[model samples]
Target: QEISKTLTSVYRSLEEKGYNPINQIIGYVLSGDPAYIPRYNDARNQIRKHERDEIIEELVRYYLKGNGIDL
Candidate 1:
């Protein structure tokens, strides 16, 4: 629930700043660059608090599990 809450909070912050959260999030994960997300509302550090590896791993876990793929 911690990561889920973090993602939700960051998404809202980005949306408030008129950023495309998906695009920005993907960029950050792909490039490991905090610049991909804005510092507005302290959003960059929100994501920076979590490791990018954990972020991507959680995403894949959700994707495969939701698809009914056995781990």
Candidate 2:
């Protein structure tokens, strides 16, 4: 997904800090648990800025776009 800069920043920060961003995000999404996100560089706070639905919506859109599917 071509995530927003907000999400992109959080993801990059998580990776830079030695956290598995993909696993963390998946855990959060599947469990609706913010605890999955790390508490570094305001990563948790940044992710909390958006609701889960908003995150999923953006992810779906980005996925479709990446596959050249126009929604």
Candidate 3:
């Protein structure tokens, strides 16, 4: 079922969002910027920062499992 979710989109999981959370995370990891993260305290901290490659693994895995789109 296509549900309404404020967070976690295909683009997000794919690291293709407008702001590119993956890039933001990379920048944050490289520069140590608290600004890259969304402001929501403990909940936001649970966002689980990850690398782009790692995120790609998650994205592909999720889509493959979610839709059975495998060869």
Candidate 4:
């Protein structure tokens, strides 16, 4: 659940800074470019701890769980 916690932290920090958190997260995940994540609140660093693929896997699992599908 560290991935979820880390992503939540990054998202909230992005929100506080007036950035679109979802957009930034999706952009970084889809493009594999760190620039999509801002350096504020050490968000960029936080995300960098995991590989892009790992992040995507977590996102997919999270989405599935939200849809009532456990994997």
Query: Top lDDT: which candidate number?
Result: 4
Q: Tens digits of per-residue lDDT for model 1 on 10-70?
A: 8999999998999988888899999988888888888888999999899999999999999
Q: Arrange candidates by TM-score, highest first: which order?
A: 1, 4, 2, 3
For every model shown, what is its TM-score relative to the native structure?
0.91, 0.81, 0.32, 0.86
List model 2 lDDT by residue over 24-56, tens digit each.
888988988888888888888888888899889
Candidate 3: stretches off by over 4 Å: 1-18, 40-71
Select the stronger candidate by lDDT from 2 and 4: 4
Tens digits of per-residue lDDT for model 3, 30-54: 5555556555433134334444455
lDDT of 3 at 65: 83
- Tens digit of per-residue lDDT, candidate 4, span 1-71: 88988999999989999999999988988898999988999999999999999988877888999999967
- Candidate models: Cα lDDT each: 0.89, 0.84, 0.48, 0.90
lDDT (0-100) at residue 1 of candidate 3? 16
Q: Any runs in candidate 1 off by more than 4 Å, and if so which?
A: none
Runs in model 2 lying further than 4 Å from the true structure = 1-3
RMSD of each: 1.0, 2.3, 7.7, 1.4
